[PDB]
């Protein structure tokens, strides 16, 4: 069979999901921004397709050609409206027969859609996949399928705003509708500055680049802040009160694969994520049900979901966010470090195969240990006190990890610093910013966890300022 | 306009043949053997092209997705008849919408010209592409032109060979038909062991690799050797008794761009070419001629042209063969650099706009200096002694150039050896067998070429054996 994919930024990594997918199905790859494409991701769409086509008008001149080795957030305009986007999916797909379409993109899981249901392929749903992608539908999906609900306002003036801090009350969730990455989530707890707040972010959101095909009926979300319990959900110290959860939807079905656990972010800027997840039995049955509820609540119908749950009093799960496609970071790759499974092969399966494909009858089970994938951002520098706070910008020399920090039979598999010489911006939102990255194992997740809070505490960052 | 490149070994090397067409035309590349694409060559053609494909069929597993760093010479099989590889060319071009079809390998030119041909598009001429690419129909050909004729004959088995010899008479050239590189290139100059000889060779050239595509109408040609007369052409000594001439061809017509002076030969290995040729106009003129007869007389039409030419008594240009592709080696590149014409991109401009292309109106004179490119090889130090004679092979470790090697104001101005640890069969065909390579550059001609010996005699080799 033949995969088209959607190459773009984010999802299932570019060092699994080429190859992974290659393995088993003859793939297309369809770039629709390629200065979206990093070095080390055009080599490896490159390797592993049968086929690449970029969208032309992306190249004006030969500076058009060169990849950057670091893409945090896509910089060029890209002013198609969803329709021609569409347009152009069904054309490359009609092009190389494809029997499948996929993306691990965010931006472009709405056209995706339905260019799907045009050519008759499996997909997210039209209206689903509007639903994924735009809060306010999402949110309201969720309170209409018998998961906590809460007050949602759609928000687009400081009128609204206003209002809506008056329906709501603090503690209020401010958020941008169509982003990721918590670009834009502001946490509203002090109603005197609160119209401040919004006008700051206000502006700010106008300063991020988007294509024109993602559409939204409002430019913000106020809702509820959802509150965390810790303790009605762990027995022990050194995770979240989130967790996210990453499944199949097959044929309108629900099929949850692994729960990780998470360390506390900063802000709102995601740390670690460990696969899988210490929580008993009965908390992951109640996680499964939400997902499940939140997901099917949607309308999705075949493709990879990543769900985001905050864990909350009374065992009560409270929906964050879904979305129609894989899990970021080396989630996907560790759930396959893990348990053996490979969520990228199984996804195609089931868009050439639907239930036919082999999907686990429940969560995976039978981990042999715990894998933790970890960055670290400026920001923990900042806290411990390795860089000045009056400090908007640094070069960084090395970032070193000092002996002893590892608890238990916990070790570093990998490591990874911004090479000797790159330069910070250290005015910029942290989840672009990450600095160093590792990968943990251990067979006991609470050292695991603890080891990873050493690590965060005393990282030394050699810098010039 | 949309140019098709059917991408694979040779010609225009990939370092300028990409940028410089992307440069002007938006480039879709086929790869009908991955198994021929180094790891560079593989980025080149992703870097540059907006779009790529691959065949299919030459992906069995994961393995077959890595890149060498060198290839020598395909090793794996193509068995698709000539009819299909014309057939995919079609389809890619269809797909496309391709304006020109164009390549820089020998393999593919005969098939391509069909394609041109059914597409309405320009070509080298169905019958002319199989002219210059069966070296008996070719020298046929030559025969015909007016140009220099020498007997040749037919040869596929010892009987063949025994007429052919009786016939010619020694000095006799012994030659497979359908290769390159003088591969299997043989003088014949001694009765008593001549069939000991062909049949030596007549068993080598059914070990070495060709695509089922490639058609001839008998194995080997025999045919009079051309005999040199250096006197007679050259003032000065320091290069050979044959040349190269780069041309291309317009609407059937010749247009001449600049004659390649070389450096003696390693048996019939290559060793050097120096852009632009020091012979005198009279001399040019009288190489520009053959190359138009016989050119011309091959019936080509929109191509690229690569001819070699002794350089025999009398001043009688003798044609040793004719390419309708590009001059290997970086004698397109040292073109540009020399003369500030971009070849590569002149092809193209023929082959979408015919002769509104800006085609010299005679050779490229004023150039403000000579550049050589200058390979070395296992056999250079062999003859240096650096290298044992009873050695079969050995790993290479470093390669230098001792200082006070260069004549006048000559300049060194790259090197590069074979990698420290490089492994070295010495049992295989120099030509596959490069281990260094240089470029020089300077005001004075015969100095470049004296400092090229220099360097060839005086090379230090460091490896074990
Ligand atoms: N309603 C909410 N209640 C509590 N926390 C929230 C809420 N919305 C967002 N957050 C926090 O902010 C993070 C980013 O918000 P999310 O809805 O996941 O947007 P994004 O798509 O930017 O990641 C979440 O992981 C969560 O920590
Ligand atoms: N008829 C000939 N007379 C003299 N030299 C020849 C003849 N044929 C081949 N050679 C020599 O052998 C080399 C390789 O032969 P050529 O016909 O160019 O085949 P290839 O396509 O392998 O390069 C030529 O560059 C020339 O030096
Ligand atoms: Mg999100
Ligand atoms: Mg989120
Ligand atoms: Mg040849
Ligand atoms: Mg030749």
Same mark, same amino acid.
């Given at each position: 069979?033949?995969?088209?994919?959607?190459?773009?930024?984010?999802?299932?990594? #570019?060092?699994?999901?080429?190859?992974?997918?290659?393995?088993?199905?003859?793939?297309?790859?369809?770039?629709?921004?390629?200065? %979206?494409?990093?070095?080390?991701?055009?080599?490896?769409?490159?390797?592993?397709?049968?086929? +690449?086509?970029?969208?032309?008008?992306?190249?004006?001149?030969?500076?058009?050609?060169?990849?950057?080795?670091?893409?945090?957030?896509?910089?060029?305009?890209?002013?198609?409206?969803?329709?021609?986007?569409?347009?152009?999916?069904?054309?490359?797909?009609?092009?190389?027969?494809?029997?499948?379409?996929?993306?691990?993109?965010?931006?472009?899981?709405?056209?995706?859609?339905?260019?799907?249901?045009?050519?008759?392929?499996?997909?997210?749903?039209?209206?689903?996949?509007?639903? %994924?992608?735009?809060?306010?539908?999402?949110?309201?999906?969720? !309170?209409?399928?018998?998961?906590?609900?809460?007050?949602?306002?759609?928000?687009?003036?400081?009128?609204?705003?206003?209002?809506?801090?008056?329906?709501?009350?603090? #503690?209020?969730?401010?958020?941008?509708?169509?982003?990721?990455?918590?670009?834009?989530?502001?946490?509203?707890?002090?109603?005197?500055?609160?119209?401040?707040?919004?006008?700051?972010?206000?502006?700010?959101?106008?300063?991020?680049? +988007?294509?024109?095909?993602?559409?939204?009926?409002?430019?913000?979300?106020?809702?509820?802040?959802?509150?965390?319990?810790?303790?009605?959900?762990?027995?022990?110290?050194?995770?979240?009160?989130?967790?996210? &959860?990453?499944?199949?939807?097959?044929?309108?079905?629900?099929?949850?694969?692994?729960?990780?656990?998470?360390?506390?972010?900063?802000?709102?800027?995601?740390?670690?994520? &460990?696969?899988?997840?210490?929580?008993?039995?009965?908390?992951?049955?109640?996680?499964?049900? %939400?997902?499940?509820?939140?997901?099917?609540?949607?309308?999705?119908?075949?493709?990879?979901?990543?769900?985001?749950?905050?864990?909350?009093? !009374?065992?009560?799960?409270?929906?964050?966010?879904?979305?129609?496609?894989?899990?970021?970071?080396?989630?996907?790759?560790?759930?396959?470090?893990?348990?053996?499974?490979?969520?990228?092969?199984?996804?195609?399966?089931?868009?050439?195969?639907?239930?036919?494909?082999?999907?686990?009858?429940?969560?995976?089970?039978?981990?042999?240990?715990?894998?933790?994938?970890?960055?670290?951002?400026?920001?923990?520098?900042?806290?411990?006190?390795?860089?000045?706070?009056?400090?908007?910008?640094? +070069?960084?020399?090395?970032?070193?990890?000092?002996?002893?920090?590892?608890?238990?039979?916990?070790?570093?598999?990998?490591?990874?610093?911004?090479?000797?010489?790159?330069?910070?911006?250290?005015?910029?939102?942290?989840?672009?910013?990450?600095?160093?990255?590792?990968?943990?194992?251990?067979?006991?997740?609470?050292?695991?966890?603890?080891?990873?809070?050493?690590?965060?505490?005393?990282?030394?960052?050699? %810098?010039?300022?």
């Amino acid at each position: 069979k033949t995969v088209l994919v959607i190459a773009d930024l984010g999802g299932c990594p #570019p060092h699994m999901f080429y190859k992974s997918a290659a393995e088993k199905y003859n793939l297309v790859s369809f770039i629709p921004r390629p200065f %979206a494409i990093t070095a080390s991701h055009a080599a490896l769409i490159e390797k592993y397709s049968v086929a +690449v086509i970029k969208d032309k008008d992306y190249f004006k001149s030969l500076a058009d050609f060169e990849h950057p080795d670091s893409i945090y957030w896509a910089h060029e305009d890209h002013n198609k409206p969803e329709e021609e986007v569409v347009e152009q999916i069904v054309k490359v797909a009609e092009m190389f027969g494809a029997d499948a379409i996929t993306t691990n993109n965010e931006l472009f899981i709405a056209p995706m859609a339905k260019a799907c249901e045009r050519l008759g392929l499996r997909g997210a749903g039209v209206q689903a996949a509007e639903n %994924a992608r735009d809060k306010n539908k999402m949110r309201d999906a969720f !309170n209409k399928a018998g998961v906590k609900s809460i007050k949602n306002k759609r928000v687009t003036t400081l009128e609204d705003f206003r209002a809506a801090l008056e329906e709501i009350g603090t #503690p209020l969730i401010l958020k941008p509708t169509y982003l990721a990455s918590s670009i834009g989530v502001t946490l509203i707890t002090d109603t005197e500055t609160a119209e401040d707040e919004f006008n700051r972010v206000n502006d700010y959101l106008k300063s991020i680049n +988007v294509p024109k095909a993602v559409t939204f009926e409002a430019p913000f979300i106020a809702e509820e802040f959802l509150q965390g319990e810790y303790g009605d959900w762990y027995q022990t110290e050194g995770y979240s009160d989130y967790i996210s &959860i990453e499944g199949i939807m097959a044929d309108g079905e629900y099929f949850p694969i692994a729960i990780h656990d998470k360390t506390p972010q900063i802000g709102f800027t995601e740390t670690s994520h &460990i696969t899988p997840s210490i929580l008993d039995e009965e908390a992951k049955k109640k996680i499964v049900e %939400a997902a499940k509820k939140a997901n099917e609540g949607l309308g999705l119908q075949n493709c990879a979901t990543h769900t985001e749950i905050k864990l909350m009093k !009374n065992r009560e799960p409270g929906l964050i966010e879904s979305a129609a496609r894989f899990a970021g970071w080396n989630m996907i790759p560790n759930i396959k470090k893990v348990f053996g499974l490979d969520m990228a092969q199984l996804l195609l399966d089931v868009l050439c195969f639907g239930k036919d494909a082999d999907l686990p009858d429940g969560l995976l089970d039978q981990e042999p240990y715990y894998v933790a994938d970890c960055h670290l951002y400026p920001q923990h520098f900042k806290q411990n006190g390795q860089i000045p706070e009056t400090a908007e910008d640094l +070069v960084i020399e090395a970032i070193d990890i000092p002996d002893g920090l590892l608890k238990g039979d916990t070790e570093i598999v990998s490591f990874s610093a911004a090479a000797p010489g790159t330069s910070v911006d250290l005015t910029l939102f942290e989840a672009f910013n990450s600095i160093a990255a590792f990968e943990l194992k251990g067979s006991n997740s609470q050292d695991v966890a603890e080891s990873i809070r050493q690590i965060q505490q005393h990282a030394k960052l050699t %810098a010039k300022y």
